[PDB]
Point group: D3
Chain length 272, copies 6
């Protein structure tokens, strides 16, 4: 009867999605796989990230937070398997920044594909790699590795990898360079095409609160002891009939340069 919501069991997303949900006014004791809300008629489900698109696609669950990377991978696999693939995206969150990018041995040499026309590429996202390669008309053999994909070249397991990266720290750590960005992933909140009776009312309520909480998180109340400074976005007494960000020493210093005195930044719990 209730609204079912799929979330990662483990990882930063689980916490990000738990915390945001808390902020949205959903009361729930920290999860150990099916959780019931005492605040509202909602049930969280904690599962592996990979399982989430398919469950929404199957309509097992109404609602699911996943990375676009995970979402397109299983979407393509199902298409290949001629399996039910349909779903409804609602909102893209500002958490879940990562790229699937082709990386090669540092001191290795190339300038685009058809340098990769024979090589073995190691990936946890073989379908996404296949998509890009096929469209590029380059031919390739995939080495399926679900963990330690960067160690594949060293091992001599494969010639190259497509690895999920946020920043080069991992790659530089594995003695590789990033050569192409073949997918840009952000975490998105999707809906089950054919899992759904005025629970849509609940869904609109959720979506609206998400933004408000986003605003309060981003925004800060400023107080400070001409108009260029007024046009700096600071709002002690703003125009009747608070900054979106303004979170940097530089603009604080920039304000100080403009002659700004008593620069006080306070946290906004919540706002509209």
């Amino acid at each position: 009867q209730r609204l079912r919501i799929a979330i990662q069991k483990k990882g930063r997303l689980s916490q990000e999605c738990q915390e945001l949900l808390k902020k949205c006014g959903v009361k729930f004791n920290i999860m150990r796989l099916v959780v019931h809300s005492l605040n509202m008629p909602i049930d969280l489900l904690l599962v592996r990230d990979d399982d989430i698109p398919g469950l929404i696609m199957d309509g097992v669950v109404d609602l699911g937070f996943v990375g676009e990377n995970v979402l397109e991978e299983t979407r393509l696999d199902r298409l290949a398997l001629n399996q039910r693939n349909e779903f409804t995206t609602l909102r893209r969150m500002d958490f879940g920044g990562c790229r699937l990018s082709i990386a090669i041995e540092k001191d290795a040499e190339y300038r685009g594909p058809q340098d990769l026309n024979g090589k073995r590429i190691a990936t946890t996202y073989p379908q996404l790699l296949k998509a890009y390669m096929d469209r590029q008309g380059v031919d390739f053999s995939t080495c399926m590795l679900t963990g330690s994909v960067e160690v594949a070249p060293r091992a001599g397991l494969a010639d190259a990898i497509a690895d999920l990266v946020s920043t080069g720290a991992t790659l530089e750590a594995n003695g590789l360079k990033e050569v192409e960005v073949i997918f840009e992933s952000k975490a998105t909140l999707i809906q089950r095409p054919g899992a759904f009776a005025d629970k849509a009312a609940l869904i609109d309520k959720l979506l609206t609160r998400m933004h408000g909480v986003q605003q309060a998180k981003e925004s800060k109340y400023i107080m400070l002891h001409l108009a260029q400074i007024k046009t700096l976005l600071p709002g002690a007494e703003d125009p009747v009939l608070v900054s979106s960000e303004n979170l940097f020493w530089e603009t604080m210093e920039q304000l100080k340069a403009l002659g700004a005195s008593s620069i006080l930044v306070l946290p906004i719990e919540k706002m509209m």
Copy 2:
């Protein structure tokens, strides 16, 4: 010479009691069993929850935070053992919500006791179960289990359990239904009858600060751009010669419905 305070070694209560104490102005580096306060003449003692009532009852310690569940269990056991049982309760905290409740196999059948007149009941709180059963005039055999009590029926170890539960998640997880609530526990701060010389001065100081910190935790400063909205409890400029809670989107939205503009909620660190 100093004021001794018994607290749980491990669990949420330890953190809750540590944090609250911090808020009460007691300076102490995070505990590894006896702790001395540099702020004030106080010593924390970290021990198993079960040991706490008995130590206060023995007067080994002046002061102790425990669940009422733990407190009555050892109180009854000592009575049975004809052991010293006396103590002084001071305050019941708003943390330590749980119930000891009799739970049965789902798809199992009953409608009150004397359906339990022969069954084996598994419990970590046998004295508390005995109290309720005896008063109900129902006869029973107890299966003493100090861990994984919910697995007893499955195992065929016992016919039923009384299990400590906060919400049915655990029970539903173990394929059982809750049938009776035989005890309602909250965490309470008690005092040693006959462990105590103007340290009572210190005790009054502690109790007063607890409430103030409770207020600041609960309460929030609101600012917002007829009287029904004034009677909504919001306090931008309240009547000279701040909300207790007001922490819900609904009332925010309800305020928005009343035409409320620039709804800003800020945290209160501390207040009186």
Copy 3:
């Protein structure tokens, strides 16, 4: 030249079983803190530590020469590749005496009967949808699969699916989840497979060397040296050309480790001083 690559589980009992057996095969190596690629200093060998799921595909891809996996994992990815029209070929060498587990359909304890018949509407939750599909198709029953990669038994409770096919060794886990076992749709043990491609020569020489030592190690585990203060060949038949000389008590080698039951059985026949000594290693 090229070194002999062996794919093994990173974590789990198999990894230990495959590590230990390899030790007994005389291959000098040490895990000495987790690392993906390991070299033996005793022999020209590299172990590779990876998820069990990765193993069939790597051998199928020829990334690695040699791989120990559960038959369950092996058929699943074999069928998925076939469906994906991917290279699926490999060479089986030996099926090990360990990795004992069954993929079996389990139902809510209360829910009952048919046990194979019907289930033409209900949702079955599995990590092995391809193996489930194989059995279902052959049974002519129509499925909806709920893909879950862990905690599959919690699916019914959750209302995620009507039924599961769960990997079980004992059934306690199903018993633990308040479900009954209804069918055994696949029987799995660990098997040692080989690359599809050209086996070089001295690599293949090394492979024959490995296989014969593995069997020898299997023999020594199974076989024990016996002595007993016992002329009745029926008791000798209780211990199956075992020789030795000596009322009369002789030192036979038995093929298979004797059971307490058969140990007792000798005692019932009037056997005294039953001494079983362990064989470290042997070669028939």
Copy 4:
């Protein structure tokens, strides 16, 4: 029918000791990830993994047929139940060769003398107040007990109590806590006990089967096959009807695993080529 239930520690050395011994008794099972109830596929048996404290009471309640516990835990709950006027009866079967520990009264190192006398005012901290009470009452000394379920040695330091009775194997722990051992008030080893009730028949048949294999396993652990390039029976008395034939060197079975000291002693007597080989399993 009903399966044979065996209560064992969830965690600790005993759990491993009781698991391993059971393995050697020929009972096929695998922990294979923590779970409260375990089934043997070799025999009709279920292990139950629980806190050591729960074990006497479960056997006393008859919830389970069979239980391995420390005598310390066994007497404590036996006396507590008696005090509570609760069912206290059970059947002991065998006392194991492991679980060696003593509940002993220890005092501040500096504090000294009497060591049994007086202590008519001082507070003693214990997890085993009933065992402490037994000894104190018999000594006619008057007590105040400080109940602590862990870190009992820290009580004096804390000023929680004047003295402790602490479970010790070595005393390092007391030495570690800056205390001296003053009395040994109880001597504990692990014992195997049985349900108070009606033992059915084939259950009891299975129980006899278990006990005799356990002893056999005990024998094989204790006993070793010997050979030595040695006609002096005094040396034979150093190895206690051991036979064999052959200056002259023969292959005797010794009852108990020979010590390096006694090994050396043979060397002193002029023994050469002392070969000790392990017996996997045997039956007198």
Copy 5:
């Protein structure tokens, strides 16, 4: 090319130095040994505390946060080894409170040194112990222990220890008394003599921001419903042409005693 900053791999300092750095406006995803800042041209290096002075001394790194205890130990060892010892201290942080102090068996007897003229002293900081002893003209043998130094007397490993202590809890736990404080350590931010081109500009920027963040951390905005109370440091409307600390119930109560009404304390995110 970038500014290299050495920090502890593990321990409270790592977190303290990570968090402070975050506050200073350095954007960096939580570290796994070399870290690159996306906010600014900076690289953090995570290493054992012992390695830090030597790396700055070698000029491998420009910048390093270490305890003065660690800093003088390796400084003296290098001097003894006739190794490069030079460096530039910049700021001493208000985190890293500890003392290396000589502690003896409780119920053991002494009143200053030459009671220690023969004894074995166990230490992880043998050079620092040697410095103090030599200057005192007392003779001694050092027992080098890198862990569990307090257990040495009990063991009979050594007659005495010099142990790093924050409060006696550890010592009292090990049945020892503190007899002398032979070094007072605080965590300090030092600079490489000869590791350094207008990156000094970056260094001045860092140092200035550290103080500002220190102020905001310490300071709180107060609002409350004669001049003695005005001279209590509280600042609702202070003199045109906010408290440094004021974080105690006592002064709150003291304010209440002066007749103070509506005492509200709010957190300051950031200020100048």
Copy 6:
């Protein structure tokens, strides 16, 4: 009297190797939860569990009588003390058959040649600067050392140093860090050393007792009892005065555990029924 103190690693394979060997030497003790000082109830002994770095210095200081350490750790602190003009003397007793590792200079894989020559400017990162100094000085090459106490291989990547001397068993770790091994500047195994001072008498008696049992344990590990259905002494030379009597098949004791290769070699010579049985313990 004074008890015999033995310094051992708190954590690592050596601690287990030294614990296990000591067990086999007949010394009764149990770790039974981490603690710095351990007492044997079998013999008058105390084990001390400490960082490997602390061990040479404690023996050198005479704090402890007896210590198992890697020669690498032993020479490092020996040289550092010499430089510090600190007491450096000790007595070596035996070098163990375990602790196999090399301190070797490794360079960026791409970077190549000289491999010992030049490096007169480059920075080398090490936890063992004194050992590096020894080798460099003897080579007449001039160094700058980067002291790192862990993750030394990450130094080049970091740009912390130009090169490393890293402790390696296999080289996988260097291979893992994208570096090549260029020189082996020190060869380390675990050795058992002794206090510099006056060895009392009965302590020293106990020490002789320990050393002879350790060797005996070494022998039993190395040596195996053989039987084979084989009159060709060349095959007997394949198994090195081994006796026994019996085409003809006899039970020789071999000094060293036979290899599968030599096992096979017998099979090539026509050997049948190769039975190797483990020797628990023995005394030549």
